[PDB]
RNA sequence: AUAUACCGCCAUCUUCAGCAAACCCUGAUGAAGGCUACAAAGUAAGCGCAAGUACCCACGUAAAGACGUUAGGUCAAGGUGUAGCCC
């Protein structure tokens, strides 16, 4: 109901600190060059994949147009462009929700 | 190359006691004997029995005071008295050391049919002669 | 026979077989290895199968102000003790089994990119907590010896830095890989370069140099560009504190040549203040995001020249065909400008 | 109880320090440390008379922490 | 937490230089550093 | 190494 | 409260004067000329980095420009005096055995240190091992001869820079001054030249130590009252 | 069964004198290398040699003799990992 509160809580500060929620996430892939698209979705029929993306791995992070402090983490502060999904590692499902919430 | 009772050189991190650091050729030169009795003197008897008793007493005390012995046992025989002198650590509570002294002295006195006394010297840590 | 029994140390030294022609030259490999276990660890003096309770050894000596007598646990009461020791034994095995996973490097089996922590504190109460260490190369070097044949040593290359311009690198050599880590990281802290950074995020100008056969071309970039450089350069740049740079490595891709070639080029970069002092002119930065506003970044400390810099109609500067081919849209590569994780 | 020559006063301060350590490292430490009022007043006075003023000034905090009334003699010294 | 047991000072430090030594070692006994 | 490496005072007369 | 005034009246005050110790009165171009300081090696021995400091070649014998030596010597003596004033450890180094005894006596007389013997590998770069972890290294190394006996640079020149120690050095026409902090072009062979250098450095060092005591004493007397 | 899993105890060079942790420096911070005494980058704990001790001497003879080499010898001294047998 109030998604912006999670980012102001002590639980959030202990898990992420002042870095973005996607800072410590790493994609598992063969080769040095990753696939040009991230996985379609990390939640499939209510089951979570082994390496869920920064959004899907924390169920308290809610992609909502009012939780602007979370959305800012997926926009470049210097250029204002929205990071493509391989940049942060979010699945295609959550990247679309972020792009719509940002707009 | 000779191997018998020789702690081999390492990286300088292995602590050895005075006894362990001296190979067999130093026996009677730099280090003494760990058991003293008359069985190995010229014209004396019963060396075999004294030797078996010593091997048992060393194993018995190793397992009776597990992890407590900080050096080899010194076994002394005078007449029919058997004195066991052991250097032990200061980890076990004093009550347990008194129990095991009473238990060991009594059990060994009935086993070998002689008055047996156990003398414990405690050290805070194993005494290091050198680091090989 | 009681007299044929040995001590635990003797039994493990034999069973483990750590000394021998197998372990001399690594003639034997160990996918399955006997692991030493301390069998006296959870054992209490006085506790045996029969479950006797000896006053003063395994149970308290006095109970209710009176000396306890010899007693024996009931068959049921002893089964619980035995079961509890087995569970305590599996719990200990599980506590050791639960070991924190460490992050990987450039690849799962690669040492490159792995952090080794800060250099060790010096003898005179010196500390380097502000410095981070990264591995760049771990090699097995094989030396043919007069009497011992092929021997195996480790050569390590590590870089250190505090993220604020101070960084260095050193080679470490030892028979053991962890001693090489200590030598390299401790030596590197005494060979630190200072690297000047423009606005504490990028280099002051494009740097193109060759070290031996390794060519490195670096480009100054604006904020938000990130580190789009050879993975080794990315590792080093995080130690120096550069956030935004493009680099291309050509010719031989030799890690050592690349490391010292990179440090040579970054330590010989002229800052804007040096340019103003050298030429006695203002340095004016024009940013397209700020339009025509002239931003003076550096002014000469000494007198200011009155004669304009000569305007050569055409500069006699040498150009890189790769840079020109890109600006003309004639550069076609499926691998350029690919989407990658944040670096 | 009374002041003494400097040689004796120094010796009494080496013991008072050792007693202070006993109060600090009691085996009842699991329970709140009981620092009697007389003990705190005497230990502080012995430090002053010995010249270990630095140690005496530090101890004044323990009067407030444990809420123990300071003695008149200690305040005057 | 119970304090670890502290070994007492060697009782040699309580011996006077004009004592009756035969009372210290009355009969054959092993060498005792704390007593000699 | 990447799996993890986990090999993992006061004294008194007459203590209690 | 009282430390800032100390460091300001004693440590920072000398650094506000161009010649606080008046070391220019110790020498002149004539005094240097009489000591044969201008005499350099033959042109065939010339080092290319010493060409700036050479006046010319007189019949294939290089002549050192004493006008430059005078300015370089002024800087070197001024630095040396300031380091003695600050109670820095000054180490004299030379491998020329003709002057080993002279140099060792000059060091003892001024209250400083001399190393004129074979220089063992790592005296500076490995001092903690050789001397101990608390060993204090020199704050200034003065070379009266920058070359060893095989006509190569003294190892301490390279190792002094590694340890961030400033170096004063007499550099003849066959020497390399690149790594010497305060080079002084001058003759290092003639007994008259070397003797002159020892008098100047000995005097500069001794004067600075007496100046340090005078200021401290005055600063204390005024402090009480 | 496996000495080609080993402990233990040994052969061999050895009728040798070298090995070597921790540092330092050179080679552009390459694999590598590091001595000069009128000395030029090495310092080196520890082990060995040596010293000392045994025998009739300070002589000789013993004893000692590191690291490493030959997956040297020995599972049959004893112990023991692994595999195998259990009417
Ligand atoms: K063998
Ligand atoms: K066997
Ligand atoms: K077997
Ligand atoms: Mg032999
Ligand atoms: Mg993998
Ligand atoms: Mg000359
Ligand atoms: Mg074999
Ligand atoms: Mg002889
Ligand atoms: Mg022989
Ligand atoms: Mg010998
Ligand atoms: Mg074979
Ligand atoms: Zn997802």
mmCIF file of C-alpha atoms (C1' of nucleotides) and ligand atoms in Angstrom, chain H residues 2-3 5-8 74-80, ligand 2:
data_model
loop_
_atom_site.group_PDB
_atom_site.id
_atom_site.type_symbol
_atom_site.label_atom_id
_atom_site.label_comp_id
_atom_site.label_asym_id
_atom_site.label_seq_id
_atom_site.Cartn_x
_atom_site.Cartn_y
_atom_site.Cartn_z
ATOM 1 C "C1'" U H 2 48.515 -52.600 -3.984
ATOM 2 C "C1'" A H 3 55.926 -50.439 -1.132
ATOM 3 C "C1'" A H 5 48.376 -44.813 -0.939
ATOM 4 C "C1'" C H 6 51.634 -44.996 3.459
ATOM 5 C "C1'" C H 7 53.736 -44.643 8.748
ATOM 6 C "C1'" G H 8 57.843 -47.020 10.748
ATOM 7 C "C1'" U H 74 60.348 -53.533 2.760
ATOM 8 C "C1'" C H 75 52.018 -54.300 3.293
ATOM 9 C "C1'" A H 76 55.971 -61.084 5.033
ATOM 10 C "C1'" A H 77 58.559 -56.805 11.779
ATOM 11 C "C1'" G H 78 54.494 -54.360 13.541
ATOM 12 C "C1'" G H 79 50.693 -50.709 12.343
ATOM 13 C "C1'" U H 80 47.740 -48.953 8.483
HETATM 14 K K1 LIG I 2 53.163 -53.860 6.816
#
